[PDB]
Design a protein around this ligand. Sequence first.
Ligand SMILES: NCc1ccc(CNc2ccc(C(N)=O)cn2)cc1
Ligand SMILES: NCc1ccc(CNc2ccc(C(N)=O)cn2)cc1
Lengths: 248, 248
Amino acid sequence: SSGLVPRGSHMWIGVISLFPEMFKAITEFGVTGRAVKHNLLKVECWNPRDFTFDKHKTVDDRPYGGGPGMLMMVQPLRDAIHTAKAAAGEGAKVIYLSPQGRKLDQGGVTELAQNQKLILVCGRYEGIDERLIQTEIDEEWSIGDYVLTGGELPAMTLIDAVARFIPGVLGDSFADGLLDCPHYTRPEVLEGLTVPPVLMSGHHEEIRKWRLKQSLQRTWLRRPELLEGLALTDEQRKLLKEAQAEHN
Amino acid sequence: SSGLVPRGSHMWIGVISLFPEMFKAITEFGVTGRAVKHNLLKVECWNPRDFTFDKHKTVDDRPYGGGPGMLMMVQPLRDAIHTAKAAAGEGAKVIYLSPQGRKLDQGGVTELAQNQKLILVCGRYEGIDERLIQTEIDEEWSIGDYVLTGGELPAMTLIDAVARFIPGVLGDSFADGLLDCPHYTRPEVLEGLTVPPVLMSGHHEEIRKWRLKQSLQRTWLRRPELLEGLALTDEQRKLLKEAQAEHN
Ligand SMILES: NCc1ccc(CNc2ccc(C(N)=O)cn2)cc1
Ligand SMILES: NCc1ccc(CNc2ccc(C(N)=O)cn2)cc1
């Protein structure tokens, strides 16, 4: 392991997945791809398929009590987890991604990003045996109240979200707990819509206050529950009241 | 376009992305990969890079009013959107994935899945010009209250979630508005933990009621706000009260 890029806060993420090639979407492209090449982020996959012993490499099994779907077969999945934990050494927290988990939000991303090592277990079918949660999983997390064909997209979502908090990965995330303000680039006029003159003014302080007021107004109109989680600054209370008066 | 697999409800999804190779994670693997091969789901990508005219194929641009980040360059992105809309023909709703969007949940997935054609616009950098939202985007959606390096993982998350509602894709999603019950597979005993005897009984009705009670108990302990959105059946009111009495 070598290179010139400061990597003091580098993260290691082990992944248990039946489809490790999915992870190329994050390891080979964009900002996450650069993090991996610069050794700020390492993503290491184990496939339960490689832990099977039968001729057909069976990775699913029938649920007790019947019902329609399959579960991940215990022995191959358990063996893959044990191999990832041995590789990771001490301090690796094991995360299972499921709709039954703790709801991920940006605060939870920053809590997760304090871990120098994670193992992300990706369930396929109707998920994993309850007893493996009890014996192998440190924390269960959901990316949101929907059901996907597997935990791989949730795992990749968490990796990407945490990676942004690794110093050096980026070249301001829900700034102030608010929805982000509108942004504008060239051209000055688009389908008769003009860039707000304040953004053209060069007045750094008036621009700051316009963006903060817009963020407060958009949070209030779209996601008012997000305001209730906040103790607004004096300046923020005044800009919201001005945006609420102007709306009315 | 041909094949034997019933595809009456087939979905077409256009995608605008600087990294269309990311979409292989859904189009080449698992249940979504099978949907694509069977013509239940088509995913068609346009890359704004192919709509550039400068020697360096520039796809970012500086925000008006300064600040740290870049935006997607308007002309290449707008041209890619127009080409996707012409390809899609009439009835294609254009979705922009952003943290400022409507929060996706399973109900919203099923609303989105009523569309036979979607175009998913994937923003990189600090996102897209506000005026393109106004002029090109039908609906803005978030997959959750976190910030990612791009809209591609959110787009792939929505495709996967909607695909499950396409008849024939699957071989019961938040059944009853509740968190799913525990599942068990072989072996009968794992690290001294035994499968609940009821699941071994063959008694289809007692198994149904045990799984419903567990789902009510887990929703109540982990996500009690989910119970408030529900008008529980008589049977559900009785099983929750029994689980709440047994907890206490
Ligand atoms: N029956 C439980 C179960 C467990 C695991 C799966 C795999 N797919 C997932 C995993 C996580 C999420 C999420 N919202 O973070 C969504 N879909 C499905 C079902
Ligand atoms: N500054 C606004 C903005 C817009 C678009 C992006 C691209 N990344 C995204 C897109 C969608 C989501 C989400 N939660 O669904 C998360 N991250 C970033 C920033």
